[PDB]
Amino acid sequence: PQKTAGMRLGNEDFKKDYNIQYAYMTGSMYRGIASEQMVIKAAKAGMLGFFGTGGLSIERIGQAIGTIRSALRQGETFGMNLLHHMMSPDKEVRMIDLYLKNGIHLIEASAFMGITPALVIYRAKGLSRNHDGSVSVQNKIIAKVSRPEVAEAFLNPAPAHVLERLVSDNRLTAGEAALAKEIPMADDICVEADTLMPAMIRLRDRMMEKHGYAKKVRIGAAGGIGTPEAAAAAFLLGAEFIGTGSINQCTVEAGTSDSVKDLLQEANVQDTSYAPAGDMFEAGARVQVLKKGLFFPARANKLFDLYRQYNSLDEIDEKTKTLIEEKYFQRSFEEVYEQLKRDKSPEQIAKAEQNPKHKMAMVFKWYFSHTTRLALEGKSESKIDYQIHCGPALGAFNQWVKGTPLENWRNRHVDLIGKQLMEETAGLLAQRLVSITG
Amino acid sequence: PQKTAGMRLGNEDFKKDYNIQYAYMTGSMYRGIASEQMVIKAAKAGMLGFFGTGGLSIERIGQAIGTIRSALRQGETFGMNLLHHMMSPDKEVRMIDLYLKNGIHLIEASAFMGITPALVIYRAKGLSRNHDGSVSVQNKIIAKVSRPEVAEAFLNPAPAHVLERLVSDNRLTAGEAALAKEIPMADDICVEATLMPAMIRLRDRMMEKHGYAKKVRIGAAGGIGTPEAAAAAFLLGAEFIGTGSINQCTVEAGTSDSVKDLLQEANVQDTSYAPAGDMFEAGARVQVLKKGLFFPARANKLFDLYRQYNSLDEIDEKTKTLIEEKYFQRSFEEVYEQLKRDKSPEQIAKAEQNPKHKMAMVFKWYFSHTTRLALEGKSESKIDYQIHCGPALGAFNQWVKGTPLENWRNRHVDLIGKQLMEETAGLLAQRLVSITG
Ligand SMILES: Cc1cc2nc3c(=O)[nH]c(=O)nc-3n(C[C@H](O)[C@H](O)[C@H](O)COP(=O)(O)O)c2cc1C
Ligand SMILES: Cc1cc2nc3c(=O)[nH]c(=O)nc-3n(C[C@H](O)[C@H](O)[C@H](O)COP(=O)(O)O)c2cc1C
Numbered sequence: 042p043q044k045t046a047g048m049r050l051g052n053e054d055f056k057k058d059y060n061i062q063y064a065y066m067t068g069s070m071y072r073g074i075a076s077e078q079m080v081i082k083a084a085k086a087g088m089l090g091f092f093g094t095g096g097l098s099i100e101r102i103g104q105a106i107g108t109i110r111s112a113l114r115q116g117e118t119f120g121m122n123l124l125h126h127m128m129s130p131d132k133e134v135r136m137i138d139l140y141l142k143n144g145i146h147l148i149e150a151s152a153f154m155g156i157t158p159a160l161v162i163y164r165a166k167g168l169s170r171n172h173d174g175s176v177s178v179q180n181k182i183i184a185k186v187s188r189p190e191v192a193e194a195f196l197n198p199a200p201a202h203v204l205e206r207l208v209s210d211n212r213l214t215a216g217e218a219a220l221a222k223e224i225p226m227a228d229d230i231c232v233e234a235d236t237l238m239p240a241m242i243r244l245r246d247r248m249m250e251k252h253g254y255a256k257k258v259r260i261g262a263a264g265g266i267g268t269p270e271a272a273a274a275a276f277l278l279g280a281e282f283i284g285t286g287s288i289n290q291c292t293v294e295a296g297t298s299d300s301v302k303d304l305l306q307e308a309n310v311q312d313t314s315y316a317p318a319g320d321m322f323e324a325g326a327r328v329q330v331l332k333k334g335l336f337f338p339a340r341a342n343k344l345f346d347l348y349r350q351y352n353s354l355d356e357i358d359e360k361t362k363t364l365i366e367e368k369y370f371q372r373s374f375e376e377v378y379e380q381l382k383r384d385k386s387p388e389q390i391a392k393a394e395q396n397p398k399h400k401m402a403m404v405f406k407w408y409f410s411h412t413t414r415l416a417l418e419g420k421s422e423s424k425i426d427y428q429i430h431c432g433p434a435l436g437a438f439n440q441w442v443k444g445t446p447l448e449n450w451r452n453r454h455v456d457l458i459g460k461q462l463m464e465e466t467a468g469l470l471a472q473r474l475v476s477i478t479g
Numbered sequence: 480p481q482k483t484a485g486m487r488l489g490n491e492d493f494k495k496d497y498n499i500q501y502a503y504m505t506g507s508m509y510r511g512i513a514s515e516q517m518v519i520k521a522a523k524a525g526m527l528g529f530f531g532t533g534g535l536s537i538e539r540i541g542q543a544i545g546t547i548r549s550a551l552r553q554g555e556t557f558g559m560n561l562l563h564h565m566m567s568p569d570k571e572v573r574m575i576d577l578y579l580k581n582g583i584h585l586i587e588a589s590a591f592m593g594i595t596p597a598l599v600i601y602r603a604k605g606l607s608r609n610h611d612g613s614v615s616v617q618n619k620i621i622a623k624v625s626r627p628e629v630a631e632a633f634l635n636p637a638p639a640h641v642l643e644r645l646v647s648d649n650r651l652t653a654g655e656a657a658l659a660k661e662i663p664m665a666d667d668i669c670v671e672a673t674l675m676p677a678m679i680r681l682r683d684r685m686m687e688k689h690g691y692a693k694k695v696r697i698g699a700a701g702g703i704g705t706p707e708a709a710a711a712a713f714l715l716g717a718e719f720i721g722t723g724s725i726n727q728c729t730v731e732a733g734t735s736d737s738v739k740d741l742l743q744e745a746n747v748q749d750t751s752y753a754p755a756g757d758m759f760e761a762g763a764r765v766q767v768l769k770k771g772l773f774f775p776a777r778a779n780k781l782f783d784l785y786r787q788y789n790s791l792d793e794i795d796e797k798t799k800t801l802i803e804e805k806y807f808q809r810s811f812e813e814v815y816e817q818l819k820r821d822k823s824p825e826q827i828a829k830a831e832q833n834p835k836h837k838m839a840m841v842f843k844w845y846f847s848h849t850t851r852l853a854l855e856g857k858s859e860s861k862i863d864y865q866i867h868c869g870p871a872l873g874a875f876n877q878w879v880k881g882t883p884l885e886n887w888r889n890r891h892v893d894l895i896g897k898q899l900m901e902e903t904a905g906l907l908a909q910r911l912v913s914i915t916g
Contacts, residue, residue, distance in 0.1 A: 239707060270676040270715050276914050277714050278707065310673055433673050440677055473714055474911040477487060477904065
């Protein structure tokens with residue numbers, strides 16, 4: 042049907058199920074960096090886009106839904122991020138409720154460690170038996186995971202004790218709960234690898250045998266993909282669809298500042314490094330960020346090293362304490378904590394007043410939200426503090442398109458770079474088959 | 480025709496130039512772990528083998544050359560490691576001199592940060608002008624590198640100020656130095672591991688810039704222990720590949736049976752990083768076998784102490800007692816005295832003046848000692864064995880689990896090489912057909 046080589050790549054049922062032309066998804070990016078504009082542009086070009094709900098209010102998310110639906114008037118598929126946080130399980134439930142009320146039938150579920158009541162409610166709500174014997178699934182889930190045991194949890198049906206409970210509470214009907222037993226929690230697993238693939242594929246096959254699901258759950262890959270070569274490698278290793286992230290932040294459509302994008306355009310492969318994440322600061326979770334020309338990585342790492350050794354804010358020696366206040370924060374510890382009193386819940390403050398360790402993290406965490414805010418806002422002339430999440434994939438992309446019309450991010454459109462990546466990926470793949478069988 | 484699928488992989492001129500059937504090399508492994516016997520077995524099977532000269536005497540290396548040549552009597556190609564050390568600059572020069580004096584026309588050049596006088600001497604010596612105006616290159620170099628700027632240095636001709644100097648000193652003739660201007664430093668770059676596709680563009684850029692007659696190929700090494708890994712490398716544009724870890728666990732490898740017994744049981748997750756002896760101070764790290772072994776933690780500890788204190792005395796008596804009793808089984812004083820016997824007066828002199836260097840020198844004993852423990856079959860305590868190894872071996876082990884190849888005593892370096900390349904070829908063709916169908 043006039044479909045290009047790029048469109049032939051990856052699993053056919055994946056493309057059919059989501060009514061898309063490419064086995065390709067743009068991954069969520071928090072605080073709307075994966076913007077309404079981006080999701081709309083991706084949907085209209087026949088690929089999968091997810092809106093970045095991370096760290097936005099329910100009211101704001103609902104506003105995003107309305108805008109996207111209004112612009113998508115040919116039944117184009119699109120998705121919403123559902124980002125798990127250990128501390129705020131009610132935000133997730135409220136997000137699901139918003140999704141159910143507003144027609145959201147596709148989510149990217151990420152950072153989950155296992156299956157939650159909210160996910161089960163979403164998966165099972167609306168389930169009905171078709172006359173032809175099949176299960177009518179209203180609400181689809183693409184689970185983004187890095188760990189086999191989380192993948193496995195998603196390849197299994199909704200756990201029975203959660204269903205039983207939700208039926209008791211009249212959240213699900215017995216019929217919905219019965220139907221939920223014979224389908225997996227996720228329709229697709231996006232394996233995020235920022236060598237794991239064959240293990241996940243073997244795990245998938247085992248789970249298909251074990252449960253005898255009617256429809257195969259596909260396994261895709263994301264992480265490190267910014268070039269035709271990287272994408273080709275992912276498909277060789279068994280990816281049945283692929284996802285990108287870093288390259289999409291550096292486009293016209295991305296919901297971040299022009300200054301951020303200017304920085305991102307100049308990134309090379311070596312220009313990123315690891316730094317702690319705000320929302321998982323204590324645990325020691327780390328994420329990749331832009332390094333070249335920026336102080337944030339060193340500074341964020343420093344604050345973790347101080348949390349690590351001392352047990353309170355007072356314990357910090359006055360010379361570094363003066364460093365943090367004057368250079369990092371441009372604010373005193375006291376000033377920060379008082380600002381935090383305004384923002385946070387009384388319960389959280391109370392918890393900090395009793396615990397000097399928690400009070401410390403709480404104050405350092407301000408740096409992360411502050412620097413994120415600085416980045417999103419175009420304003421600061423000092424770019425030195427900008428927290429910018431980014432992997433080497435972008436660096437690779439930049440080198441790929443060096444000296445091209447695509448070099449300037451103002452000519453980079455999320456749907457077009459997506460298309461070109463997939464078409465060139467396809468050509469590269471075919472070209473190699475020519476080479477080795479010649 | 481009559482070439483297997485495995486032999487078709489990679490760049491054809493790479494295979495032609497080195498008169499081999501596979502675009503495949505076994506990497507050097509120090510102290511003769513890449514043994515004469517291994518290099519011979521690889522050469523006879525139409526692949527590239529490099530002898531592990533690292534940490535051996537010039538006399539020992541010269542003896543290795545003789546043994547290898549005698550067994551290779553059909554003009555089979557083989558190579559020698561040239562391992563750069565910042566502080567043994569004369570060993571390199573003497574190694575080059577030995578290579579020139581003997582039949583060595585191929586080296587694997589590794590750990591170089593840029594181009595040195597010794598490398599230029601090697602490259603430029605044999606040079607002759609061909610009748611057609613082209614440069615006849617006698618002495619070939621495969622540069623193993625991780626950094627773009629080092630690769631670039633190798634993709635460039637011998638730097639002019641080094642040539643000019645060597646001519647002045649009558650090490651090179653003006654003719655040799657002239658010819659050297661129009662050929663690159665290396666014939667091949669083995670990129671040691673997203674860097675892959677980047678390096679290829681850099682190569683192309685350098686080809687355009689200098690218009691070399693022969694293309695410099697770009698290959699890949701690191702993490703390759705299975706058909707999948709090897710298939711991925713070629714798909715990503717590798718024009719040849721090199722392996723290391725999988726070869727240490729073969730009959731031919733020059734290390735102890737007990738080391739190989741440990742290696743046979745390795746899984747992907749059973750390795751970690753530890754500092755390297757020869758580049759201890761700089762903070763260079765290398766991958767080693769971890770599971771069941773104390774060496775990694777202990778080697779790391781010693782670096783943390785070098786990092787922090789500025790002398791041996793400064794170490795608190797409780798950790799000082801740990802190191803002496805458990806790590807070394809010897810006192811600091813006993814070690815230093817042993818070192819006086821071994822090392823050059825010049826090195827002792829430097830330690831006597833500098834307490835920082837004296838410390839490293841003493842900690843470095845641990846590395847040479849544990850390396851020796853591994854090479855020798857003897858110690859029943861395997862706990863201190865320094866064994867270099869990456870996850871590639873773990874992957875290989877899982878690949879051959881429950882097969883005749885499971886026992887390392889049935890693992891031959893040439894045969895696992897062949898099998899890897901043949902299966903790599905089959906995997907690529909079968910999957911590319913599937914994926915583009
Ligand atoms: C700036 C940025 C923000 C991101 N935010 C989220 C997020 O909020 N939730 C989520 O599940 N993934 C998030 N991701 C991950 C991407 O969706 C995608 O999975 C990942 O970036 C793929 O890795 P790659 O950049 O190497 O292509 C984010 C990535 C970036 C670069
Ligand atoms: C035990 C061992 C010793 C090695 N010794 C050297 C060496 O002396 N000089 C060198 O350039 N590379 C040395 N290497 C690196 C290998 O030549 C090869 O490049 C590398 O192991 C390939 O990575 P892989 O193990 O993932 O296959 C050594 C590797 C191992 C495993």
